[model samples]
Target: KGEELFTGVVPILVELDGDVNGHKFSVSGEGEGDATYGKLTLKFICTTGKLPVPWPTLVTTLVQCFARYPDHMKQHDFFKSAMPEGYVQERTIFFKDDGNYKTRAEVKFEGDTLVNRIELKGIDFKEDGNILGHKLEYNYISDNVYITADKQKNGIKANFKIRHNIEDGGVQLADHYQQNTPIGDGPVLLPDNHYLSTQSALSKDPNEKRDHMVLLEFVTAAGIT
Candidate 1:
């Protein structure tokens, strides 16, 4: 009963404890971050609570491992098990855990584009809370893929392919109700005409288009097998 199980500095735990919550374990370790990204301190209370990795770490690990294993996770209902494959992307993901507003986001870029997408459900948007990514409301069941294709607008999230939802209530719906546009800052929440507009003009320009797809030579199985 006197052994260190884990250690780290990035997450930087300030407290650690394990208690008996029946046949399973509880790890409500208080740490040095707020609630979200700083939800650094967390606990595990699941039968399949994959040992060695916390819940948050589970998401990261799964995404990295199952980037191409969607059908497998689907059979297991592994919600926090993956993200789409790519170098980098910007996106928000929400989960309905114990009726709480547990939301997470990732923001990153590759070359001239910003890839960001946020998915949420049961969002009480009428409360005193922080703003979300692009306010996409892409109707979270999973994966509302947002990607920027241009390199202009001075590092702002511009010129993007904003998707609504490809699957309706888990059913395929129109290859995703998506619309590509040249955004000035944030996303255009073109939800049937409810525009989340602005004063300084963050809308996309209609005339200029840039997909930034370079014609590169590649190798594959038949090409590399």
Candidate 2:
């Protein structure tokens, strides 16, 4: 029975269901499994985007310009300090109408390790955004970028993926929808008890009489590449 049935990097697929104010929402993404280390690194993209407008660009430029000025640097000190070393915040508007967004991450282990010592780099920051399936508008579609891990029906329990828990409080867009993303600034560690990370958004549509409160939960599942 010692056959080498498993080898190389494998693909991971994840589908999550979310609840917001008794409403239902969904999110699906994929990732990769590291054969060498037996670790899975999942990626999600969360950011509030802009509509087709011209003024937002100007505001972005002015803000970045001011953040660079010697006297005004204090205002953006938090932004620089929170980021990874040698990293710069986006030069454009924090949420640009143009394409190009950040990818949030979660890591998992086949060994059922506990992620007990996670840190919160910041709270209520604008880095959080909406999930992939929630349609704020017809044009702006933000997708979760990467999937980590592989499929194995070993029936063995493997838990612990890194993520930003909702209780930590993420940032929301100022637009009409007020969409939110749960992305955070630092590394994520999983709990020994096996918990999923969740993010929620309040979506309002003037065209409809009812509003949808969108909540997104994230998790990883094993699958073959």
Per-residue lDDT of candidate 1, residues 1-225 (tens digit): 000111111221111122211222222221121211112222222333422212221121111111111222222211111111122222222221211122222322223222232222223322222111211222222222222222332111211122222222222221212222322333322211111111110122245242111111111101011
**Clashing residue pairs in candidate 1, if any?**
27-43, 90-115, 90-116, 90-117, 91-117, 92-117, 182-204, 220-224, 221-225
lDDT of each: 0.20, 0.23
TM-scores for all candidates: the values are 0.17, 0.22
Q: 1-225 in candidate 2: lDDT tens per residue?
A: 000111344454433332222333333334454323333443321112222221111111110000111222222122122222111222111232212222222222223221111111111222233322122332111212122211131011122211222223532232111111112434222212221122122233355332221212222222211
Q: For model 1, what is the error of residue 220's alpha carbon versus the real structure, in angstroms, after optimal superposition?
A: 18
TM-score of 2: 0.22
What's the CA error at residue 225 for candidate 1, in Å?
Answer: 22
- In candidate 2, which residue ranges exceed 4 Å CA deviation? 1-6, 45-225
